[PDB]
Amino acid sequence: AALVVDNGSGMCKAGFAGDDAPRAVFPSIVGRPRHQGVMVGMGQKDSYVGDEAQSKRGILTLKYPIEHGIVTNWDDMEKIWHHTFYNELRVAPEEHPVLLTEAPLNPKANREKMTQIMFETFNTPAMYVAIQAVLSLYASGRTTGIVMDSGDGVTHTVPIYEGYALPHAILRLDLAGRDLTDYLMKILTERGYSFTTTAEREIVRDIKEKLCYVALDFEQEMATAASSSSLEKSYELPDGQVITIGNERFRCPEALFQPSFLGMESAGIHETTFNSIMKCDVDIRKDLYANTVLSGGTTMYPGIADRMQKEITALAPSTMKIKIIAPPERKYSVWIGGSILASLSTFQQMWISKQEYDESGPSIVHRKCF
Amino acid sequence: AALVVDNGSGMCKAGFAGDDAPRAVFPSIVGRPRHQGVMVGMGQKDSYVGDEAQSKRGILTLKYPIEHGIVTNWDDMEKIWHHTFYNELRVAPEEHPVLLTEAPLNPKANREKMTQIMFETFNTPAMYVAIQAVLSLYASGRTTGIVMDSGDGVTHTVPIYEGYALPHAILRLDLAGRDLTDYLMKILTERGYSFTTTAEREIVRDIKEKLCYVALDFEQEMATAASSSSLEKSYELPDGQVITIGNERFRCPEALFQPSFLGMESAGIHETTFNSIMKCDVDIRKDLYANTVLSGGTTMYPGIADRMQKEITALAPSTMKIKIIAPPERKYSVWIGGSILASLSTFQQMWISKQEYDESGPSIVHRKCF
Amino acid sequence: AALVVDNGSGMCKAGFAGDDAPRAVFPSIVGRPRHQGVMVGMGQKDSYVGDEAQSKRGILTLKYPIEHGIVTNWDDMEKIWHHTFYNELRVAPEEHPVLLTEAPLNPKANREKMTQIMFETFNTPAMYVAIQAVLSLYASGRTTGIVMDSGDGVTHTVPIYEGYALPHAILRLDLAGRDLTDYLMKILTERGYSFTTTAEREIVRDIKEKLCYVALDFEQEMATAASSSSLEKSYELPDGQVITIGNERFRCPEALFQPSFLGMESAGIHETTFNSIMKCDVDIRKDLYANTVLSGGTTMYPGIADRMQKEITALAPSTMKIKIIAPPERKYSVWIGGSILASLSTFQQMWISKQEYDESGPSIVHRKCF
Amino acid sequence: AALVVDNGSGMCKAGFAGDDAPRAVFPSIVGRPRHQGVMVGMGQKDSYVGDEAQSKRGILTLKYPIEHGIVTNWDDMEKIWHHTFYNELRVAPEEHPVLLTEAPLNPKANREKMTQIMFETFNTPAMYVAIQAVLSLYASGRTTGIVMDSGDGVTHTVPIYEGYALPHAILRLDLAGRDLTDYLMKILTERGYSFTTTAEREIVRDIKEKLCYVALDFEQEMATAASSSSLEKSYELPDGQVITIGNERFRCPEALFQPSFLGMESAGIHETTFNSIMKCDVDIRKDLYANTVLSGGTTMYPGIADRMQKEITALAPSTMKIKIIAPPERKYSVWIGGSILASLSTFQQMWISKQEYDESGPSIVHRKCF
Amino acid sequence: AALVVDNGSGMCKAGFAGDDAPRAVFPSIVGRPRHQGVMVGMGQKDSYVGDEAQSKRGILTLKYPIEHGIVTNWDDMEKIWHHTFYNELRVAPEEHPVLLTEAPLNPKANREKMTQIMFETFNTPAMYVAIQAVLSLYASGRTTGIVMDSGDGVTHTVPIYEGYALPHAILRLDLAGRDLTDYLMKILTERGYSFTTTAEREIVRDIKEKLCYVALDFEQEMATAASSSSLEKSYELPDGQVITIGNERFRCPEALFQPSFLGMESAGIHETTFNSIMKCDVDIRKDLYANTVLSGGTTMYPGIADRMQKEITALAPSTMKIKIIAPPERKYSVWIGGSILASLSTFQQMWISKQEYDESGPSIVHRKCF
Ligand SMILES: Nc1ncnc2c1ncn2[C@@H]1O[C@H](COP(=O)(O)OP(=O)(O)O)[C@@H](O)[C@H]1O
Ligand SMILES: Nc1ncnc2c1ncn2[C@@H]1O[C@H](COP(=O)(O)OP(=O)(O)O)[C@@H](O)[C@H]1O
Ligand SMILES: Nc1ncnc2c1ncn2[C@@H]1O[C@H](COP(=O)(O)OP(=O)(O)O)[C@@H](O)[C@H]1O
Ligand SMILES: Nc1ncnc2c1ncn2[C@@H]1O[C@H](COP(=O)(O)OP(=O)(O)O)[C@@H](O)[C@H]1O
Ligand SMILES: Nc1ncnc2c1ncn2[C@@H]1O[C@H](COP(=O)(O)OP(=O)(O)O)[C@@H](O)[C@H]1O
Ligand SMILES: [Mg+2]
Ligand SMILES: [Mg+2]
Ligand SMILES: [Mg+2]
Ligand SMILES: [Mg+2]
Ligand SMILES: [Mg+2]
User: Fold this and answer.
1) Total number of domains constituting chain E
2) In 3D, which of A298, A269, A271, A71 has the Cα closest to residue A184?
3) A151 Cβ closer than 6 Å to some ligand 1 atom
4) Measured between alpha carbons, how far is residue D14 from residues D63, D106, D120 in Å?
5) Which residues of C are less than 8 Å from D283 in CB distance?
6) Chains B and E touch (3+ CB pairs under 8 A)
7) Are E124 and E96 in contact (CB under 8 A)?
8) Both C170 and C185 in a single domain?
9) What residues form DSSP beta bridges with C102?
10) What does the alpha-carbon distance between residue D37 and residue A364 come to, in Å, rounded to a whole number?
């Protein structure tokens, strides 16, 4: 059975091809103690990975080895893959082909190191790197559509028509979930809440996932939040302190549609999706308008599909049918699509075998993987 | 039952002799993917023919194997004939004689390859190549008249009197529907509309067939279009964008009467028809003036019969009766005339049999076919 | 003295007729602040034009009012002309006739607005719009030749024989310098370099002008770049960071010859030039082969004249003499040719006077200007 | 004449706009007796403010109403402003507009209460709240530069380019002078010196301001202090006892560059300044490197400008010119810049008038003040 | 077998590692005769240590060599260690490694002299100095918790999470048992009881240990003691005189929670514990609230655990579970934890050997001991 490992900037989702859900989902973090150990005879490790790092984060410095879809610390990235194979899935990676994922328009050295580490460190028999948005279209059972995938590091749009990708129409924004977490940390200082440490950034991320939503009309929502407390929500911190937030609930996700909130010059996710459709041939735009697929954890805000539909309807001609497909399990669409792809019989010759790697080096990944 | 296949530059019209209409009408196009397929397990063909190429044209490069009535790509021409026999008519061509059509003054190697491919690739029992304008006179139930046939590639005039053709009076213009489509693409840039791809040329062809017409007086029509918006028409593109055109509606078909719009030195279709009549003997010109038959898709513009009558009346003596016969089904006159010819009992000895081809080679077509 | 203003998509070149070089050359950009001003009493303007926008681009959003040779923002286009007349040339435009330039096959409303703004906003006494490629032939001292002009927005070919243009043989590609800048930005992500803002696009344009070149044989050059670092060059960014590029140096200009690198279906500049020659009469093709003139900033790549000569030699018959004329000042050939034309005594009746505009409206430009 | 009041966490600096130095500088403290008064007929007040609290601190409990730039005791903050207006400046605040200062990224309720108290308690005619680091750039006579302001409560960096602030690049550390005073109190216990009361914290602050300095190389300085007594300095306590300190002189300011000395996870002031520059557009970083301005009392350590230059030079590219501007009066740069701003004629419409406050409430400060 | 010696300000607790209780517990006192000896031939020593000094205190001046956890008389401290080794434990210290204890935030010269005296005076083979509160967490079998240790000289709080100490959150009060003994001596003068000598201070300490308790509500207890004699207790002095005390029973321990009773400005032990928890990361505070461990003789007052729980519950958020762990043998928790630590196999490399001391001097203790 093939292994499907979806390494996003924030989460590692791993499991077996053929299953309908990942067997292991844990934060893609490595934590190291920032204090001195005074207790002799206690099992204190040098570093912690995943859920252990998250539960001990009070005395750790948390580090993400992946930033904006790009591995910035390959030693910590090996710790996460080792944790994935031996502690989470409890398999020997030298017996299973591994399907990995990547965002488009990434540095070429990123997937070359992924290939080298899989074959030389873990000794995988076969290996493949797929594009994340392409896998989301597999999960939706479609061959035509434009996928807007947004996770913790990258937001990218890939239009596909009749199984053919339009690479010149692929767009990528380095604005995603981690930028929204940092923006929420900033605007929480307006109410006197101070979150600064890496452990406190994990608390703000949990606040964002529980209380934030996308407003259908931002200016009308700002006027509603300024006239009453009907939008205020409370949240209990780990130490029992209760914080209350109002318009920050929808101002944080609003940066997806107005990146100028972050000082960015780029277009919002609605204009990025529309611009990607407009870079495609005129004869396929109607089918892309009707098959706009949302994917990733940053698309899980309540109200984001209705807002995307409203914004793209305003940009597109009035005779086009704008249909935003936001399945309830779209947080795992990339993994589910990879599980489908790695199980296809027509895919079993697409693997990069160990023999091909031995006779071509890590640059084989550029010839065999899109 | 004999098969009647009318291969024009733009459309393939096929059916059975004895019927009154073609059973299969599809564009004479072969489309090939110009992007990379990223969807595994999907039925993606290497090339698409006819209506499938037209519906998938957003990701294809469309190619016409016939240009100006001459086959320029014999491998793609076999794909179209194979699509015609096995997918459209769903017959075995080795059981039916096939009647093919051709424009006059074509290269001799064109109909020799048609003969070789019919007998050696499709194994037809019998075969024949007829002149397209002669078949149009069969469809009109006449034995005297001059036929002006204009399709997508060729415009040609053939005068016939009492069943005798006057070959020295046959004229041919390489100006037809595809040149008008390219001219409309050019003059649409004046309003800021940019059509460049082969798929967008199919959109402009559809605009031409729906909105273009022939003005009775061109200069008066240009003054009318410049003083009001009564001639403006709108058209919705496949992606919902609406374009508006004014004098381009009649400037595009005007190139048929003023080929200098295209930079050509040749005479218009009205002067070509008149010059063909004047090359005939004086005693038959009166009957040709009264039996001017229009044929082909490029004669389907509204107002072209009234314009042809007005222009030829100005060229001919005032005592001649100019009568332009433009039947409503003249887009299929060549096929209908071929269906009539292939059903005649006096035609059953005109076929080129397999035995005659085996003992004479493909050059037999020059002895048995006019 | 007449003013000669060459408004390309990227640069504005202005000066006086009779001079041999433009007196003012500045980017055709308008920049607006995208942050909030916190310094009271400082001379902060609402918008910046030209060189001021380029030096302050760190806090501006840069906008080109001309895209693909077509003015898309007429309010910003007036700012550039006002900057040209009053700040760069320091003249009163109501005392000088103005010669403007335009690409062929442009929307008719583009040169009508140019005429209206020159006469009603700047009150010019006379005015004229010339075709850019025709002016390049004036600068080369020829009356016969085909000019391939390629700037920041448009690539167009105009064949001229004995002073007569062949308008049906004029070709135009919407592929030029700005598309190459955007393509270089895309392929720089392969090495991990991220350029996204409008200010960073100006940095990539400077990288392109300093390090990019045209390979004589692309596939051989790709093999050379893959076997050693002899083609690698370094470039220091404004903040001191040094980037290194290898095969991107010649892959970016290669899109001129292989537009499929950009997802375009069009032919390269070599095939466009050859197709334009083949649309001309057979008797003039030999003189066009020997007088192929390159013009514009996008023809300034090292090695492009040798590549054009090699590619057209492969397309043309072997007995033709292919001669590519690439003068060292061909970046200013359009302006130099306009300076020559506006100084001719036989041109002084070709001007559109204020009286003719008052009695005919802006549509006078279609009667008096080619 | 406008009043300029710079309320830092530690000191209150007040004076008149147009002057070059504050007229009143006193500690921002309120002291209350912690013993029982036994002397009848003596003028014993209920609380003491400023210099009186500092001279009677032996029998008082000293309280700072501002902690980390945030007012935590608004009743004591009114005592300090009342002391400022009526006892120090000896003016009637209802006759003068008041310019106040604040650190960036403060709670919004902090400047709303400042506005309400100024208009309702002191009845000021006009009022304004400026950012402290922006005022320091006024004092240096610059419109471009990054200001690192560090007082008793807050360290913050504000980059400004051509008079435009980059708010997304503003960084703030809750590590400043009071944290260094508490750290010195802690490491003085290593030599047996015990300072615990609020009055003794004022003694340690005086030790810090007289004997502490920033080492150019910390590890080399630690080795020098461990091999001889050349770095030892003595200090006489108020009761005549003499203490001697060695490496504590530079270990206390070292916490600015290594906040892990305090158990903090944050970056040092050198990395905070560098990270703020790196959040800015690439085109402005060179000017920020050359115009790094130090401001506040915590930047008054001997050797801090040379250490900042050495640390930022190691972080920045080697071709950048790192220039640390540390003027000798940088302890009053915020006040001096406020005196300059409040005197500008272009600032006289930036005031928040009493009429605007009456029709908008204290929330007017968010619309009119950055 | 290792020796475990817990030298507090008041008591010396010594024994063997591996045992569950100290073998020798005696007062850390040295007594010297203050009268003239008139009896010849009687065994009169020059000084008395421990229990002998306590039984002869009528004719001695008693001196504590340790004050507030700091050795103030190193000659008398050697007498106590000599008494410990040779008279109480009856061992040769040159054959056993010795584990010593110390309060945190002590002068560095204190543990350096402990190291020098152990290696040079007693010739111990190995030696170690542990923090007292850390040893109390060993005795409770925990790796997470905040220990409030209070003996005769020092009260200190050390928070520990997963075996990691948070040194920046360690707090220390110089308010402990000896300050309460002196305060009881002072308030006993209100009833006419005069205790002044060092021998009489030992009597008051015995009164405190037998009759004093912590009131749950101090003001309610003061009203109960003022309305009846139900709280009065009697105590017989060594000479048969009987004293009676009422509210002094709970006013003396109340100084632990209200240090202003002693003229101190510091916070009570409940606020010190809470402030130490609040200096820790937010993610560990919940576990510290549930694992507050009391240690030392000053925590042996009846009712102190219920009072600590009530006071910390009022300070902490209402959703936190406040659990005060007060084991019945918490007077020996430091020694019991040292006996556990010195017996661990993972501790046998933590010893400071004689070789390490010979090559590094007494400053070795700062590198090897926390
Ligand atoms: N319910 C939710 N609402 C908003 N954001 C969410 C939600 N769930 C997850 N996220 C965000 O999605 C990001 C990661 O999404 P995901 O695509 O699952 O992982 P990765 O980015 O690692 O591929 C995180 O930044 C997280 O904050
Ligand atoms: N209604 C119409 N008006 C104008 N042109 C038409 C119309 N219908 C078809 N055409 C043109 O006729 C050309 C093809 O005509 P036809 O004779 O049917 O096919 P072929 O040229 O292949 O024999 C095409 O170029 C098409 O644009
Ligand atoms: N030396 C060079 N090499 C390559 N490209 C260049 C060079 N100089 C200018 N260009 C490109 O030429 C384009 C503009 O050329 P030009 O014709 O001078 O202006 P315009 O297009 O505005 O008429 C720009 O996109 C620029 O990047
Ligand atoms: N010469 C000095 N050396 C070191 N620190 C100083 C010096 N002078 C003042 N400070 C520190 O600066 C802090 C206050 O600085 P300042 O900016 O003037 O006031 P505020 O923080 O109230 O705005 C105090 O903590 C003080 O200890
Ligand atoms: N039952 C008790 N109640 C109150 N206080 C006590 C009790 N027992 C001992 N103490 C006090 O504890 C202090 C010493 O405690 P301990 O921690 O055992 O010794 P050391 O302080 O020397 O480490 C003495 O001041 C003593 O008065
Ligand atoms: Mg993802
Ligand atoms: Mg036809
Ligand atoms: Mg140009
Ligand atoms: Mg300050
Ligand atoms: Mg103790």
Assistant:
1) 3
2) A298
3) yes
4) 20, 21, 20
5) 57-58, 199, 203, 238-239
6) no
7) yes
8) no
9) C131
10) 88
Q: Are residues C8 and C115 in the same domain?
A: yes
Query: How far is residue D248 from each of residues A111, C193, D326, D353, measured CA to CA in Å?
Result: 50, 45, 24, 50
Pair C23, C149 in one domain: no
CA torsion angle C294 C300 C303 C305 (round to 10) = 0
Q: Phi and psi for D317 in degrees, rounded to 5?
A: -60, 150
Q: How many CB atoms lie within 10 A of CB C232?
A: 14
Is the residue at D314 inside a domain?
yes
How many CB atoms sit inside 10 A of residue B358's CB?
10
Sign of dihedral through CA atoms E53, E54, E57, E58? negative
Question: Torsion angle, CA of A293/A299/A305/A311, rounded to 10 degrees?
Answer: -90
Ligand 4: residue of D213, D300, D334 to mutate (most ligand atoms within 8 A of CB) is: D300
Q: How was this one solved?
A: cryo-EM
* Alpha-carbon distances, residue B126 vs B92, B97, B353, B369 (angstroms): 13, 4, 4, 13
Does D273 reside within a domain?
A: yes
CATH number where D220 lies: 3.90.640.10
Pocket lined around ligand 5, Cβ cut-off 6 Å: E 8-11, 28, 151-153, 177-178, 205, 208-209, 296-298, 300-301, 331
A108 and A20 both lie in a single domain:
yes
Q: Which residues of C touch B34 (CB under 8 A)?
A: 260, 265
| Cα–Cα distance measured from residue A362 to residue A369, given in angstroms and rounded to the nearest whole number | 12
In the structure encoding, which two tokens stand for residue D142, read together? Answer: 């610059």
Domain CATH number, residue B287: 3.30.420.40
Quick check: CB of D10 below 6 Å from ligand 4?
A: yes
Residues with CB under 5 A from ligand 7 (ion): B 8, 151
Q: Do E290 and E168 share a domain, yes or no?
A: yes
Note whether residue C51 is domain-resident: no
SS3 E257: coil
Q: Is A152 in the pocket of ligand 1 (CB under 6 A)?
A: yes
Q: Which of B348, B327, B370, B329 is nearest to B17 (CA)?
A: B348
Q: What is the rounded CA–CA span in Å between residue E295 and residue E140? A: 10
Q: Where are the alpha helices (DSSP H) in chain E?
A: 51-55, 74-82, 108-120, 132-139, 177-187, 198-211, 218-227, 248-254, 269-278, 285-289, 304-315, 333-341, 354-358, 365-368
Instruction: Give me the phi and psi of C332, to 5 degrees please.
Output: -115, 15
Q: In the structure encoding, which two tokens stand for residue C319, read together?
A: 């007995």
- Ligand 2: does its nearest atom lie under 6 Å from the Cβ of B251? no
Q: Which of E370, E362, E368, E369 is nearest to E115 (CA)?
A: E362
Q: B22 with B125, same domain?
A: yes
Domain enclosing residue D313, as ranges: 138-175+267-331
Residue B130, helix vs strand vs coil: strand
Residue D231: enclosing H or E segment and its boundaries?
A: none
Q: Which two tokens stand for residue D149?
A: 């302001």
Ligand 1 center–CA A261 separation, angstroms? 20
Query: By a Cβ cutoff of 8 Å, what residues of chain C touch chain B?
Result: 70, 105-109, 166-169, 174, 260, 263, 265-266, 279
| In a shared domain, residues A15 and A101 | yes
Q: Among E168, E263, E266, whose Cβ lies nearest the Cβ of D262? A: E168
Which of E164, E316, E318 has its CB closest to that of A35? E164
Nearest Cα of chain C lies from the Cα of D62 at a distance, in angstroms, of: 37
Structure tokens at C300: 């300034």
Rounded-to-5 percentages of helix, strand, coil across chain E:
45, 20, 35
In a domain, A19, yes or no: yes
A46: part of which helix (H) or strand (E)? Answer: none
List the resolution, Å: 2.2
Do residue C339 and residue C204 come from a single domain?
Answer: no
